[PDB]
Ligand binder design. Sequence first.
Ligand SMILES: Cc1nc(C)c(CN)[nH]1
Ligand SMILES: Cc1nc(C)c(CN)[nH]1
Ligand SMILES: Cc1nc(C)c(CN)[nH]1
Ligand SMILES: Cc1nc(C)c(CN)[nH]1
Ligand SMILES: Cc1nc(C)c(CN)[nH]1
Lengths: 348, 348, 348, 348, 348
Amino acid sequence: AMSLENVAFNVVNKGHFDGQQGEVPVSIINNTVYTKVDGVDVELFENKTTLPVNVAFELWAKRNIKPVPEVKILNNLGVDIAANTVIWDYKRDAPAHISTIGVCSMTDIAKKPTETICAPLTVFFDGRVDGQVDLFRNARNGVLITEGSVKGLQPSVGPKQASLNGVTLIGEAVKTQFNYYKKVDGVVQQLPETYFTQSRNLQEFKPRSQMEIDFLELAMDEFIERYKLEGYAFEHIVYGDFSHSQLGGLHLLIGLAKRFKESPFELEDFIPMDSTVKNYFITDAQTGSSKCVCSVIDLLLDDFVEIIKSQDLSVVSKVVKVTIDYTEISFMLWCKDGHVETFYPKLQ
Amino acid sequence: AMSLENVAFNVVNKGHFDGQQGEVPVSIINNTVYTKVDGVDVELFENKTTLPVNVAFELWAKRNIKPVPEVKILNNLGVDIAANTVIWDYKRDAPAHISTIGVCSMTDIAKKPTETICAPLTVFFDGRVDGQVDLFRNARNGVLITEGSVKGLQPSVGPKQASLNGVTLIGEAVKTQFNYYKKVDGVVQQLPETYFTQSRNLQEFKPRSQMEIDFLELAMDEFIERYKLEGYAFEHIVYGDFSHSQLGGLHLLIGLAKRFKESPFELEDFIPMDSTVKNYFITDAQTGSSKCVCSVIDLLLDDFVEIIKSQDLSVVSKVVKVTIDYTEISFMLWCKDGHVETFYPKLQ
Amino acid sequence: AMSLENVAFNVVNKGHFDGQQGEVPVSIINNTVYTKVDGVDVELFENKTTLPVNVAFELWAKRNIKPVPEVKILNNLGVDIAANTVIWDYKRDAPAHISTIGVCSMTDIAKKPTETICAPLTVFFDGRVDGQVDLFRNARNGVLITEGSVKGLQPSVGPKQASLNGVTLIGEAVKTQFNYYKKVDGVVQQLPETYFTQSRNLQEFKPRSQMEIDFLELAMDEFIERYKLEGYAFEHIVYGDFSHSQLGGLHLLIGLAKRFKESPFELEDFIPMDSTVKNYFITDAQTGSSKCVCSVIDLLLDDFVEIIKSQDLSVVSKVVKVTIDYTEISFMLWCKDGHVETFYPKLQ
Amino acid sequence: AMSLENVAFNVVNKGHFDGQQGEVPVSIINNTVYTKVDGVDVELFENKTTLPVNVAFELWAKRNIKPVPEVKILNNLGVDIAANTVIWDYKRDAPAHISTIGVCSMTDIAKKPTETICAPLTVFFDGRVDGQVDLFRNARNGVLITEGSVKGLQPSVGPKQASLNGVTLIGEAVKTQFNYYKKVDGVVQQLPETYFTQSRNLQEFKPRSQMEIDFLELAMDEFIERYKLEGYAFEHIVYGDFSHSQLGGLHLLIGLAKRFKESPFELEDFIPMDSTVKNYFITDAQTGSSKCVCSVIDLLLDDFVEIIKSQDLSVVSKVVKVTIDYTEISFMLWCKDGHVETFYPKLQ
Amino acid sequence: AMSLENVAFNVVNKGHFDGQQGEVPVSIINNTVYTKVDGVDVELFENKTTLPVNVAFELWAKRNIKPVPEVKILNNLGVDIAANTVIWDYKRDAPAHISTIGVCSMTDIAKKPTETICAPLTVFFDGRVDGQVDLFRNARNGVLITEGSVKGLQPSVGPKQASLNGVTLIGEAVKTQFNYYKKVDGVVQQLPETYFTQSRNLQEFKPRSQMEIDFLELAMDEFIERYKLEGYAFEHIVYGDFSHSQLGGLHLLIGLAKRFKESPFELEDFIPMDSTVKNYFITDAQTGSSKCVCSVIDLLLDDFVEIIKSQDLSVVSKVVKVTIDYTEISFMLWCKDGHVETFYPKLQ
Ligand SMILES: Cc1nc(C)c(CN)[nH]1
Ligand SMILES: Cc1nc(C)c(CN)[nH]1
Ligand SMILES: Cc1nc(C)c(CN)[nH]1
Ligand SMILES: Cc1nc(C)c(CN)[nH]1
Ligand SMILES: Cc1nc(C)c(CN)[nH]1
């Protein structure tokens, strides 16, 4: 019994769509939904999507308010659509998926994921919702998350963090670590062994290991001494070189976080979306060092050290493929005389 | 139980809002309402009003589909709002009135016209709706239309024509001639003696008298001979003078209609709204004669002849006030040697 | 090697997309594409679709410029997408189908219809394009049109008319009558026996039989006499009754065409799309007779007479199902004393 | 002698509308007003209102630049319109009122508040403007503010703070505490005894009493000990419970301010407007505790303690009505064994 | 070989336009350019200019990514257009100039600055680009910047700072100090002796001299004592007077920076553009002191002290003209009894 005024009533009275009965007067102008409160219009939703305003408003109101996988993880697993929920992409302020199943009459391709239209699409299933583990078992393509064991199904432990209403966090009052399962053409696939990105911000970066605590506290030459990193080009790769017009390295988020405490810099997010590897046009404010495409990855420093220390350094240039967030990331490894020159997430 | 999807269901299934239950999926883009019909969007309403798209859509769906007074008549009588209906202005493709009573939650100032908010406004009442003659009796300010007698109330016979879904016509299968009543501060007013404009189109003009039949069939000098119009400047005023750069006269719609059969002309309606007197920037295609503001009135030729023949012609210039469509229309009368030079609906 | 400036170059220089090389400067404002011609912007395309302006522009430039099936026929046959072409819906000024195959990078779901994404969709194939009869043979779901015989495939003769650049016509210099074939899950279907709508306009209606020539020339009571139509309510159904406030019958386009020569009327197309049965809110200008939902079908009068004369008239009300344009159209048959009262394409 | 170019001249040259003579070239595109400065367009005003761009621009330029009552106070007193000024709502970036009196030709319902149209509306009068105390005396409905005594009129001391150009503050160089007067139907009404909200921000919260200084400095169990708050559920109500998936209590702004210093949290203002009680969808970043509708009020902790300590605690659940900012706020009081379980501003 | 999809490919893959070959699917909706990434639209550019969206997108992608003169300097020198580059105005998010030369087909007035159309316009030339010093020599009107000497041309040393991707800085890894040259009507003009504004922010203000270090550390009466500023009204002019309703003085950015550390204030930038003298509507949050037009200049305190100490103080009021950023700034000097009362950048 869906309607614009009923979705708006739910937004005004419940903070989101809660299936409540009622209507509030709504007015649509430009790409913004308004409601009349004591004679005047009050903005409820500014549409930043490529969907019609009322359709985007309904999808946002029907967004999942439970901790869910980060959009980069769902994308890396090939999720096309979600079963009976909307995964809201908070970075893009838009639905993570084009179509829906049992959510909105305008975007729905089906009411239930068991409809033959869904068979070729990778449907996201949530084991926390009743019947969705069974729906995953009968779906030809899909990705399932659960809080515990699924009889017979071999699990893949996902990252510790999940997104709750746009806030990435490692849950204390809620579970954020899920078991992951994937199926392609009716067959359960073996999810690869993988590292996970840490999903930290540059402004509120917090070290998550003793190595990371030492990197941020210690000076460059003494940290490299303590962790036996001589010859691995951490000076260029992690710390960054701000001496020439073109900024050198600076590919690990922790390096950007360290630099940020001393002097500010501009990071232009020219493809603003959640992704395992991010690309920024960086301009260092202090020196004027800059780089058009500086690929940045947020790995735990211990994981990055483990990755770089497990490479054969006897070749000038090669592609090193590492599974991170379930996807294969290609790193360009440059060496000279058995020592690393640079190691960066390869720009395709 | 109003909603956008329910108004749209009524539009799609009943042609207008009929109070039916149901919903159809709707999408709003730009200022247009669309509905999904077998996978594709079909336009239902393009907003040409200054109201929000969804609000205009609802008001148009809730328009009065019965023959109603033309907007120029309602305006001339000072109608501010209508009781429990929407008068759709088809010349502007917008609601004739700013607010509503018992129609739409966004535009409603009241649910019933008996609310004290309505007392200072001239409410339009329709005797054809049960209880509205009584509502008019208790309203402080109002305009009432009826098909027959109202006990005690002295009627004012309105024009023969009414607007049915934007089509002005003299009804054969429906009654279009109404009795009119008006109240100002609780007192039933004596509506003045009035002429009525004929509301005819230039393209499909039809004569409504023998004088009008003769005007369109006979040549200029023989019509003026037959009707003793010598010295009344019908050559300039009605027929029009296309000999100089500035078009002479041409203020009566019948004259424009006659000219139209021989050669076409451009009429720029720069204030496109329903009004007793219309103003056009006219460019005659055959001669190139033109005039920025050519005021045009559609009076029955017999009425215009009666008006001009009842004027004292012994003064160079004066204002002749005529009650047309219940309003006072000032005309400018120009004379010389006891004969008319020009007579036009005055530009203020 | 697709681009906005290249599509625009093709539009400006070839009238449509012809695969030519070149670019013209383009500017996009509002929902309109402009091109600079000697210092000033000239409109090329105004987007009336729900797609992004540049995407709609490309699809319209890449429209099929050959006579193709009318959108109502494709819809009735369940066509979801077209193979390597765009069917432009000129009644909606939008693409007939949501997605494309080998046409535009933004709307493409595949490059070739042989991709497994297309298997569950009914793909439209054009025998006039090389290899498309073979593509239809290997497609699981599809609709095929041809100019002649396909070995082994039993044909279904389609209507005489086809749409050429939005102009429906029976071709003299081009073939417009196609053989139709359909497959559901790999099985060649037996297309039902069907009547066809004539797709005529009200303004330029032309009779296509002696019965139709007689209907338009003869008076009501003598036509009904000549064709033994006494007791079939053609007076109400076809001719129309303009005596009461609610317009009676008027469900056959030929009747609207006949009425149109005597007096004009307003037809509000509230669901403006190509369909076998059309619904209009009609207001007769001469009488003021009106009806919110007047279903109108354009059948050849001989076909309508054959349909109504082949019905059992011994029941008050029943649903009469007729295959028209390959689809099942429900009609409502109302009888009394063995005679027809009304027979109209049923409003669901 | 109003004009768009004259309002723009005043904005460019005086920072607001100052009644100066002159014009600057203006261009309107989208919903933004621009001015040409040395060959290029410079944004003057981005319209975020539901009014036409030029109308909103004029109202914003004509905004009151003196300390005025906060919009929540005016709303709580039922103010419909202001006399000869615009109260700009900085939180909504729109005029606080639909219409004006003597301000803008597009929004004006009258030029002077003495016009009969204003009689039924509660007009806001400013005693600091000459003649407005007299206008209030003759107005049927209205709200008056003054800096001192009005002969015969019994005053209501308002809050210490007022809004100056969107900045809420307790004035040192200007008076921000006003006397308030209200009239309904020609009769001066007795304004109730009321508490006042403190209007503080979460990010720049400052304690305004020794109790508040102790709440922010002291730990939970020692503050409750010092102020004899045992059994009043301040642990749940003020401090907040972040242990379960649903966040417990957290209804006093000071509690949110204390929590904010330790760890951040998201507050979704889903009805973004000035109001005595605010509703937020809160997501605690540290724990993942969340609540869809967390009603938040900014009372001085001493006032909240006085309110909760003056309640009978011998009932399971009841509505406690408290006058705050002149309006009656309903609080839901939940008790068990003579002790408080929760006390929150009741969600209607 | 320019195209929208090629500019977008360059933005996605290089961070800006780099002349690379390739295309990415693009969609334009509203005034925003999007690209499809794994099924969903990702925003590439939100148009805030008065140019068409695709044109602004191309100009922004083709922006100069090298340290360039700040827009205020180019404006002060009368620059109309740039040679074969786009100077992006980051404060206005728009191109600094209306037209281009050899950049975009929509905005280009010429391909090379040697075309007679450019002769009357002051073209900006960059000596760092090959052939541009020669182009300047043959241009009738122009402004040239270089890193070193130009044979025969007498240089003007510009400011230390330049804008790199919107970041104003004094370069360490890149040169930001340029030599400036100007030509009017084929004749090299002598650039005047000039002071330079420091281009500092209020939030991240840093002292650039011992006098500035002392101003920020020392109290008002002791700083004035140390620098012999008694009688120069620094208390009013630089420190600001927040005691009356109208804020006194506060015309030097360093004064606003000092005040900012103690208490916050609102600065309304009503003409948001880069300029030597800025105008703000300031509201002090602590006191409620305010001023509609507070002209603010960021001079090094030593330079401002030198300017004010080099004035004759024996007149009530006079205009003091000082060349700053190459332009003549008029200062209003008010004196009494041989002492300064106020000294502010005169509001024209
Ligand atoms: C997360 C979110 N909420 C809203 C109201 C939006 C629209 N910009 N986005
Ligand atoms: C009379 C009318 N019908 C419609 C669908 C409109 C919107 N332009 N106006
Ligand atoms: C058939 C058609 N041509 C054009 C240029 C359009 C856009 N309204 N539609
Ligand atoms: C307070 C305010 N000033 C302006 C220019 C606006 C428009 N967003 N709002
Ligand atoms: C500097 C800049 N980049 C972009 C994507 C814009 C559009 N707002 N402006």
